[PDB]
Structures are given as C-alpha cells and as structure tokens.
Design a protein around this ligand. Structure first.
Ligand SMILES: CN1CN([C@@H]2O[C@H](COP(=O)(O)OP(=O)(O)OP(=O)(O)O)[C@@H](O)[C@H]2O)c2nc(N)[nH]c(=O)c21
Ligand SMILES: [Mg+2]
Lengths: 47, 731, 60, 160, 189
RNA sequence: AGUAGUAACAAGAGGG
RNA sequence: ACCUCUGCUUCUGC
C-alpha cells in the first residue's frame, strides 16, 4: 500500500537497508558508500 | 548486500520510459500494472500442452539459463535459444534443458525442504507408520459434514497467520501492528529458528506457512471418525460398500481424544438405560470398548474430563470424579440448589427465533480457571451476582464475559448484533453467544446496567468498560479475591440405574441429565460389544436393525407366529429403542403388538413388509392406549423422521421395481384388499365409498360401532373404506 | 417434518426457460432499492448504478 | 407488448415491458410487475428480520475497504478504449490511463469507490480522447454519445 | 505547518555525521567517508516510515513506538519528536509528552521567538545547530509578519459521498417502470 | 473432393 | 517466383 512512487519507495528502502547492513556487519563501508552514492545519482537523474 | 539491485535500479532509471513509469506509478497502482498482459488464461490447457509438447522449444525460461547450461548437450540437442517469449525477456528452451539440469546442473542442499514442506512430509510420515486392520463390507450412510482437512495447523485466523508470516519471512515490512498473542509469539520464535538461512523462495515459504498455520475445512461424505488425520485418508478407509480399518502413525490431539471419550461415554450410557440391567451393561461396554485400540477403561482412569456421562462411567469403574462440568474453558461446580432443563423460544438482538434449552432454578456456582475464579449465582436466566478474582484484570475479563453469557439473561439475549451454518446445520447456541460477546462486549456492558455498591471496604467493582470503580459496578458484578479443594476428586457410588451418589448418599448425577446430542467421534470408537452394532451411528442403528430382521426373517417369522413375546423382547432391538422418544416407547409398543395380534386373528391378511417395518417398535413393555398412530417418530441426529404406519415413507419404503426395502436411501435386501395392522380395532377393506357416508379423519373414528364401515383420510392423500371389528384383540 | 402424515408431497424437477432473456434491469433496480431501504442514500444510489446501466445497455 | 422510448443520451430504442399487460399464454414473457416483485421482497424481509440490514452493512464495509485492483480479477472484458476484448487487468489499466489523460483521477486514492466516481463523472466529458494505431498511432476524440455507447456496451460471442 | 515542521526536522540532521570510530561531528561537505547521525523519518510516506522504524528496532531490539516519530539518533539511540509552536514551548511540551506517555521518545519543542525546550532540559544537538533552527523560525515569523500572515498562521497549528452527475441522472430517470417520471420519485415509491 | 453443420476450415498476414 | 512472421490473440462472459 502507498501513494509513494515506486522509485521513492525503492530509494528509501535501499538507504535504510544499507545502513542496517553496515551497523550489523553484513556490509563494508566501501559498499555502503557505493549504494548511498548510487542512490543520490538516481536521485539526480530523476531530476 | 543490496549491491547489485541498486545498480540494476540505476541502470533502469537511465531509461526514460522506465523512469516515467517508476516515478508516476504509485505503490498502489503497481498492483494494476503488475498484471498488465496481452497473454490470456488458456481456455483448453490440456489440448494446448499436447500441441506444444510436439514442438522443439515449448518451454519459457529465464534468459540467465543461457549462461547456466550448454546451448547443446552431448547428443546434439539444442537446449536453449535466444527467441524471447512474447511479453518478457524469458527465452524459448527445450524440455531437454530440464533433464540436462536434473542430471548435470548445479547441485543444491535441501536441508530446509522437510521443514518448509512439513505439511506435506508429515502426510507421508503418518502413512509410513500407519497400521492396517481388515476390510469389512457393509452399507453405511455417509453424511455430508464440514470437516478439518489439514493436520498440524495452529488454529489461527487468516489475519493472525498473515501477521505471523510477516514477522517470520518479512519482519521489516510488518508496519505498525505487531503481535499480541503468546501463541503467535512462540510460533514466530520456532519458525524463525527452523527456517533461518533458508534459501528457498520466500513465496513458497509463505505459501506453505499459510497452508499449514490456518485451519482449513471441507464438506465431505464421511461415515467414521472426523479428525483431520482420518479425513486425510478418507479415500483409503471408506468406500461405498466397505471400510478399511486403519490407524495413522503419530499421536492424537488431547482435544480429539477428550471429544471422543465424551461421545463414547454418552453412547454407552444411552445404550445402557434401555437394558434390563443398566449398570451391568455399561460396565460390560466400558470393559470391551477402545478408542484407537486404547482401552476405554485406561482412558477413563487417566483422563481429567469432567462430563456427566464420563462421570457415570468413572463412577461405575471406581474412579474418583470431580463433580463439575466445563463451559468456555472454565470448570464449574454447583455449590447449592438445582434447576430444570426447559425448551423455549428466544428472540435475540439480531431479531431471531432460536429455541434451545434454558436452565431454570437456584444454583450457586464456584468456577475455577487458568488465572481466575469467581462465585457466580444463577436463578432462571439470572445473574444474581458474580464475584470474580484473578492474577490480571485481563483474566477477570474473559471469565467476566463467559459468566454473563452463561447466565442466559434477557439483557444478553436482546443484545447480540444466525442459529445455523450455511448447510443449515444447527449450531451450539450457548457457545456461539459467547464467541460473539467475546470479540465485542461493547453492547452487552452498556445494555447490562450498573449498580451503586456500598462502601463495604473490600468488594470493588467493574464498570461498563473494564475500568475499576469504588462504590459502583455492573448489575450484580464484583471484584474481590478468594476461590485446591475445588479440584479434589471424590469417591462415589452408583446404583443399578446409573444414579451417582456421594458417600453420604446424595444424588450427584442421573442418566436423564446426560445430553441427548448425538455427536460424531473425531477418533474411531470400537465397542467390541454384543450390545452394540458393529457399525456405529444412529443411521446405522436403523439400517442394521432392518437388514438383520430381513436376513433372519425365516426364524423371526415363525417366532412371530408361535412365540411373539420372546421375539419382542430380543436384545437386537434395544439399540433401536434409543432412537424412539422415551415418552412414546410404551404406547408405540402397545399399538404395534395390538396390530400384530389383529393380523394373527384375521386370517389371510399376513404382510411380511408391515411386520418387518413395525417390529422394532414392539420392544418395550406395552401400555394400554386409545390413540391411533399414523406414524412413529424416530430421532436421527437431533431431527425427527416419521415412519408411516401405512405404506412407504422416506425412512422406510419397499420398491416394487427393485424388490428391495430401502432404509434412509440404503437397500437392506428383501424377504386381498384387507389390511389388518394399520388401525387398532379396525380393518381396511379397500377403496373408499360415497355409498358409506362422508370422509372422517382418523381421530373421528372414535364413535363407530362393530361392523360399521366408514371412509377415512388414512394417510398420504388416500381415502379408504374401514370397518370397526366385531371382536377385539388383546395384549 | 413440517407436513402432516395425511398430506401428499410432490417434487417438481424444475428449469426456467429464457431466464436471461426475460429478467429485467428495471425490476432489479426495484429489488436493490427495496433491499437497501432505510440505508444511506449514497450507498443506495451506488448499488442502483449497475441496474441502471443494464437498462441502458447495447450489444456489439 | 411494452412501451418504446428513445433514450435522450444514446438515441437507443428502449422497450419497457414492466407493469405492461399481463401474460396471456404460456410463452416466455417479460411482463414482470413492480408491485408483485416488491411484495415478494417485503415477504422475504419479514421472513428474515435484520438480514437486509446486515447484508447492507457488510457491503458498506466492503465498499470502504475495496481496492481498485479487485477489478484485476476476471476473464475477457470488453475494452472500450480498444473496442476489443482484453484480460481484465489490462482492460482496467487501459481505462485508468485514458481516464487520467482526460482528467479523471480520483482513483489515485487506490480505492474502488473512487474509480466508480471517476466512471460516472467521465460521462460528462464533451469529448473523451483515446489513441488508435492506424492501418503508427493517432489521437481519436469520441463524441459524448460515442463514449457513452461504448461504456454501456456488452461484447458478444458464442459459447463453445 | 507541514513545510515548517519538516524544515526544522531537515535542519536538525543535515550536515551531521558519525566517524569511523563513532563520535558526533558536523560538516559542510556532507560527503563517502562518514555516516549520517540521524535517520529522518518525517516526510517519508507512512508505510515506508514504518518500514524504517521497524528496521531500526529490529537492529537494536528497541521496542517499537506507538506513534511515528520525526527522527532517530544513531548516537544516543533515541527516537525524536520535533515540535514547533506559536503559543508556549512550556505547555506544548506537556501536551505531547502526554500523547507520547509510556513511549520512549526525546521531545524537542521550538518556539518562533527562539527559546526551546528538550527532554530533561538536556540537549543532544549542539548550540550552533539549534541556533540555526531558532533563527530560521524567527526569520520565518518575520516573513510571515510583514507579509500579513503571522496573525493568520497563529490560529490553527467525513461521511462517504456518492451522487449522480447530470448524464447518469438522466439515464436513471429512463430506467424505471413506465409510470414514473424520475429516479427520485421512483426511490420514494 | 473432404471435414463439417445454422458457419466455418479447406493456410493467414506481411514484404518484394 | 521468392522472402519473413504466425498456429488460442479482432472471437470464450458470469
Ligand atoms: C449454560 N449452562 C451450561 N450448563 C451445563 O454445562 C454443560 C456444557 O455446556 P455446553 O457448551 O452446552 O455443552 P453440552 O451441553 O455438553 O453440549 P452438547 O450436549 O450439545 O454436546 C451443559 O450441558 C449443561 O449441563 C449449565 N448448567 C446449569 N446448571 N446452568 C446453566 O445455565 C448452564
Ligand atoms: Mg435455462
């Protein structure tokens, strides 16, 4: 359920998932960078 | 990780169309576009598959197949192609690719399979460890009932299963609402543990968990045990003319066992009351009966069920009883007084006639419980006052409601907001009025009232709320404390007629108090008894009795002619007596024996079909009566069937064309104008006659005289010429 | 059970001819309005739509 | 033997047999009588106190809860945007899309009843615009009448 | 109110990070070596917001709040309600500490004057950082005031509908038994 | 011709 | 004369 666009929903999921991944040990910083960065590119390309 | 998915997304968003779609499609609207298709549901899949399986590449597979398996196999077969399936990026492949993968593909480990697919694997386990008895051949009515079809469920609603599955498979997507129940939480823990690291598709996990957790049912013709482990193998255990005795591997629910114990005990009690020596007969049946090959005696020794029939059996066996019954999960023990069962009609708040039993009389009740207790008082549909205690206010709540329901008051009757299921089968009234007021007290509490209780610095109060109040409460409701010696099992004695008394000689239980409800056992009962038909059930009492008469007809006929009273008293007719309403047994007997004597007296008017039909009704000390009967009532599963004295009925009819007697729709084989055994003290001569005056009812033949012939609406639209006989026949 | 022993009982094995071709949208409009008597007008009008559309239908 | 009228909106010839003359033979007849129907329904209400009210309250609850996507369930559906049959979901998608392009989008709520609102409001449009693929793609403007006739259309086929 | 509240929220977090070791820090670059101190929850669509809440609670085994908070702090591991009010920081706090009674949420009210109020008059945010918010609020109330709109703003902080539009109404009128002139007459009958 | 049976198939569509 | 595509997709409801 949601009024959010499919894209905004996916971006917010990726961000939070990458954070918990990091502060659980599952993911390194040089991934967590790559994701949050990719997210911001998508963010801008959306613009 | 989440590495490659975001890269993909990045990729997609570079494309303008996809970006438009992704930016202008809400999450809600995704539901629509997800099903957007040019492909239609195949209308004839059987034909289409036969056609396509002739083709080189009928299967559609993910494009990644192309990197996962060789294009050709050792034998020269092409296994995949680059042709896109219409509407996707899947590609067209050969069935040879499926076999290839199955011989030479990536091997996975399957540790989770048994756990994810437990519902299915459990079926096999129960079969692998099942035991077969022999096959018996007989005709038995299979009555269509809603039954459970999936053993090992957790009795969750679809809401609660959803909530649990969300926590197990998709915990971060749960949203606001999290799990109330401790049942939910303990299931979640277990499943989380069993299915950790699981790499099977979460679609299959969720699908399986949902199938497994929710109780599912179905309407099926079923003659025997209705438990789900039996339903599961109905195809194997039950045929049109046969039973394959069988016991599934694994343990029964305590709930199924308890339920069956009650049914067995009631059947035994009801059969025993009609014997010359009830206690002797009950003891015999107790000592031969088994449930799933467990002796009933052992079950009765070790089972805590407190129920009237169960307690009669326990008394007979020298087992100590708790003279209590359960209602809504709480044990009730009446302290003082008593009341009366009464059948009367009740307009509920739904605006509905619903005419089940009332309790009418003074009754003090001590009520134990899980975490709660109370001192309910009850008159006639009255809550004289209920003082409730417990660990939590919560535990005082459940029981609080239960007790208002139990009261039978008009304030809960006219407060509900049907009496049957959809198949129009009657349901449990004083348990469903509980279920309703369970999840919605609202109306009840604000339609119950309140009370201004004195300062008496001890007896608190509960309001039309759940709130606690100082010197107010609900109408007759209190909150105090009190309530070990409730559970103490006492030594009792029992007389020849099943009356149970304490060591001081006080009447605790009488057979007439035993519920008349004819239930269906969840587990197989074998009486192993000469006092019970081999085939269980009321319908089978009917078919078996008539089948037995017919097959023994030569003997029984000569006994009818030479030695009637021995025939009437034969033991094979006692089960059938339990189908006849208690109050009618004697008059029905009297009527029957008189008709049989008239048949003897008026020579050449023998009729074997009439004798067979009426014979079971002879088996009770007869009483004198004036009453003429056009039918006898039998009670079959709570519903009167009427067997017509004259000719065929739905219950019992002779079919000329087949030359068979049909009883509730089952063949039980086969063996002048004057009818000697239809009216007592009259003969039917033949067709009515206008030249003998107008048409009387039966109940107006009253004042005719020897030799005097009338016209009678005798039954089923017929009018016949009768004659009041000149002599009489005595019994 | 509800009958007396003196009554005849017959069963019609029954089929309706031209069911689809003889039921009428206007009649179903009446049924819906009657069934929903006393209910909120928005709901009544909502349910009445289908019958009204059927009264005004055309076939390809 | 009923009454003919011309529909103001579609121009359709419309036959009304209701409260018409009573059947005169055993041939199939459509001369149903409103007052007789209402008597039967009232008789049924009497025989089932509270049934209509409850069934109505359950329907109201459903109206509130039901999502647009409920309409994705179904088989072949006449698609007025194509004047052709399509799977239900595709037909739904097409209607939603053409609606929003013509300014009807209460259904963005995601609730079915808002789509129903859109449907009725769509009939006020002077000129519903759709696109054909010429025999390529091309904008077509339907007259109010064209659109209404399509909205009220049943597609027909033979039963195999 | 919605734009205002959400601006404060955004200011509260933007340009605020955590190290490789893990000490609160401020920065103007806002960049792939550090990590945001705060999760911003406000502005997210409700379902997504709850997704974020749940994800965090599952990582910490923090209990889940009854209400949707505005932020979460990865340093103090608290959820945060922001408030903005024309009336009294004094009273609007205890208005919300009510709403959130039993919860475990740092509250942080801000008035348009400047003066603020947090939990246990204890601040998890720095002075420079709160300065900006307090300032921004006043400068907004200034832009509100000289626009004519502060006096307006400082005084705020259904049955289902379904009817027939004209065409469908006309169709309804023509779907009746023959004696009736219109749908409303028929419905009354 | 044949299949069929109240209307169809007995190749269709597109390019050149 | 060749080339290409197609074998439920202008036609299957509740
Ligand atoms: C409402 N009840 C319940 N009850 C006793 O509790 C028993 C169990 O209640 P129930 O749920 O109706 O079960 P039961 O009657 O066994 O069901 P069935 O006979 O249909 O199988 C009843 O048979 C009855 O003896 C009561 N006993 C007394 N004295 N007064 C009451 O008001 C009530
Ligand atoms: Mg028909």
């Amino acid at each position: 359920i949601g009024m959010a666009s499919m894209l905004d929903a996916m971006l917010s999921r990726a961000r939070i998932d990458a954070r918990i991944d990091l502060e659980s040990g599952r993911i390194s910083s040089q991934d967590f960078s790559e994701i949050t960065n990719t997210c911001k590119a998508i963010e801008a390309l959306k613009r | 990780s989440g590495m490659e998915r975001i890269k993909e997304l990045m990729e997609m968003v570079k494309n303008s169309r996809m970006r438009e779609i992704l930016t202008t499609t809400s999450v809600d609207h995704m539901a629509v576009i997800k099903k957007y298709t040019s492909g239609r549901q195949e209308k004839n899949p059987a034909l289409r598959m036969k056609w396509m399986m002739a083709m080189k590449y009928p299967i559609s597979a993910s494009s990644r197949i192309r990197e996962m398996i060789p294009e050709k196999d050792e034998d020269g077969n092409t296994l995949w192609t680059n042709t896109k399936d219409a509407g996707s990026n899947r590609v067209l492949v050969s069935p040879n690719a499926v076999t290839w993968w199955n011989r030479a593909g990536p091997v996975s480990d399957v540790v989770h399979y048994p756990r994810v697919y437990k519902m299915y694997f459990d079926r096999l386990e129960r079969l692998t460890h099942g035991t077969f008895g022999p096959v018996k051949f007989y005709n038995q009515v299979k009555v269509r009932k809603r039954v459970d079809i999936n053993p090992g469920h957790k009795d969750l609603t679809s809401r609660e299963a959803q909530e649990v599955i969300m926590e197990v498979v998709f915990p971060n997507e749960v949203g606001a609402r999290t799990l109330s129940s401790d049942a939910q939480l303990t299931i979640t823990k277990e499943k989380k543990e069993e299915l950790k690291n699981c790499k099977i598709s979460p679609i299959m996990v969720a699908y399986m968990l949902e199938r497994e957790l929710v109780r599912r049912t179905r309407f099926l013709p079923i003659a025997g045990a209705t438990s789900s482990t039996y339903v599961e193998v109905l195809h194997l255990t039950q045929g049109t003319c046969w039973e394959q005795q069988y016991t599934p591997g694994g343990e029964a629910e305590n709930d199924d066992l308890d339920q069956t114990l009650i049914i067995a005990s009631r059947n035994i009690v009801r059969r025993s009351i009609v014997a010359i020596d009830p206690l002797a007969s009950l003891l015999s049946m107790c000592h031969t009966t088994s449930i799933s090959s467990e002796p009933l005696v052992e079950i009765l020794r070790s089972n805590p069920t407190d129920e009237q029939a169960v307690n009669i059996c326990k008394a007979a066996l020298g087992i100590r009883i708790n003279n209590s019954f359960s209602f809504g999960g709480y044990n009730f023990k009446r302290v003082k007084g008593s009341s009366q069962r009464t059948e009367k009609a009740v307009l509920t708040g739904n605006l509905q006639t619903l005419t089940m039993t009332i309790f009418e009389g003074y009754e003090e009740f001590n009520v134990s419980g899980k975490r709660a207790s109370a001192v309910l008082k009850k008159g006639a549909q009255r809550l004289i006052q209920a003082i409730i205690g417990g660990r939590t206010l919560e535990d005082i709540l459940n029981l609080m409601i239960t007790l208002m329901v139990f009261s039978q008051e008009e304030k809960m009757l006219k407060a509900v907001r049907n009496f049957v299921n959809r198949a129009n089968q009657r349901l449990n009234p004083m348990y469903q009025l509980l279920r309703h007021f369970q999840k919605d007290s609202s109306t009840l509490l604000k339609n119950w009232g309140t009370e201004e209780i004195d300062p008496i610095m001890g007896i608190a109060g509960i309001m039309p709320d759940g709130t606690i109040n100082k010197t107010q409460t609900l109408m007759g409701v209190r909150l105090s404390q009190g309530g070990y010696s409730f559970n103490e099992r006492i030594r009792v004695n029992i007389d020849k007629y099943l009356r149970v008394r304490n060591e001081k000689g006080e009447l605790l239980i009488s057979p007439e108090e035993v519920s008349e409800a004819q239930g269906q056992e969840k587990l197989p009962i074998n009486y192993n008894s000469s006092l019970m038909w081999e085939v269980n059930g009321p319908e089978s009492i009917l078919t078996n009795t008539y089948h037995w008469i017919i097959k023994n007809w030569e003997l029984l006929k000569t006994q009818w002619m030479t030695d009637p009273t021995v025939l009437y008293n034969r033991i094979e007719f006692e089960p059938f007596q339990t189908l006849i309403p208690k109050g009618n047994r004697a008059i029905y007997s009297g009527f029957t024996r008189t008709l049989f004597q008239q048949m003897r007296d008026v020579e050449g008017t023998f009729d074997s079909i009439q004798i067979i039909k009426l014979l079971p009704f002879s088996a009770h000390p007869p009483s004198l009566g004036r009453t003429q009967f056009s039918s006898f009532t039998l009670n079959i599963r709570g519903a009167p069937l009427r067997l017509l004295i004259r000719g065929n009925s739905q219950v019992f009819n002779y079919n000329q064309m087949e030359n068979v007697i049909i009883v509730l729709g089952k063949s039980v084989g086969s063996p002048s104008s004057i009818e000697s055994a239809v009216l007592r003290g009259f003969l039917i001569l033949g067709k009515a006659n206008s030249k003998y005056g107008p048409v009387l009812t039966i109940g107006e033949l009253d004042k005719l005289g020897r030799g005097e012939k009338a016209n009678v609406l005798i039954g089923q639209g017929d009018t016949v010429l009768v004659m009041k006989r000149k002599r009489d026949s005595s019994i | 059970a509800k009958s007396t022993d003196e009554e005849l009982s017959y069963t019609i094995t029954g089929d309706n001819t031209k069911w689809n071709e003889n039921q009428n949208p206007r009649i179903f409009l009446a049924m819906v309005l009657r069934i929903t008597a006393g209910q909120p007008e928005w709901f009544r009008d909502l349910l009445a739509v289908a019958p009204i559309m059927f009264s005004n239908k055309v076939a390809r | 033997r009923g009454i003919w009228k011309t529909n103001s909106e579609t121009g359709a010839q419309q036959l009304n047999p209701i409260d018409g003359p009573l059947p005169e033979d055993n041939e199939p007849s459509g001369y149903a009588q409103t007052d007789c129907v209402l008597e039967l329904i009232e008789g049924l209400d009497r025989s089932h106190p509270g049934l209509f009210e409850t069934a109505c309250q359950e329907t109201i609850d459903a109206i509130q809860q039901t999502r647009v996507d409920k309409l994705t369930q179904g088989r072949q559906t006449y698609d007025w945007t194509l004047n052709r049959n399509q799977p239900a979901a595709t037909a739904l998608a097409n209607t939603i899309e053409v609606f929003r392009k013509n300014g009807y989008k209460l259904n963005e709520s995601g609730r079915l009843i808002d789509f129903l609102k859109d449907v009725l409001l769509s009939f006020e449009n002077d000129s519903m615009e759709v696109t054909t693929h010429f025999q390529g793609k091309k904008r077509v403007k339907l007259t109010k009448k064209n659109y209404l006739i399509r909205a009220l259309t049943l597609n027909t086929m033979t039963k195999d | 109110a919605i734009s205002t509240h959400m601006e404060v929220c955004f200011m509260y977090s933007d340009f605020h990070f955590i190290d490789l070791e893990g000490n609160t820090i401020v920065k103007e670059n806002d960049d792939a070596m550090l990590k945001h101190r705060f999760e911003i929850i406000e502005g997210q669509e409700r379902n997504i917001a709850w997704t974020i809440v749940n994800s965090i609670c599952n990582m910490t085994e923090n209990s889940k709040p009854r209400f949707l908070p505005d932020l979460y702090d990865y340093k103090t591991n608290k959820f945060i309600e922001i408030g903005v009010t024309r009336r009294k920081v004094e009273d609007y706090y205890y208005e919300k500490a009510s709403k959130l009674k039993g919860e475990n949420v740092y509250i942080h009210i801000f008035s348009f004057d400047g003066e603020e109020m947090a939990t246990d008059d204890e601040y998890i945010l720095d002075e420079e950082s709160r300065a900006r918010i307090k300032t921004r609020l006043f400068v907004l109330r200034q832009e509100l005031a000289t626009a004519g709109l502060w006096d307006s703003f400082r005084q705020s902080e259904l049955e289902e509908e379904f009817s027939y539009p004209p065409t469908f109404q006309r169709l309804a009128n023509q779907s009746l038994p023959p004696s009736f002139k219109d749908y409303h007459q028929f419905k009354a009958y």
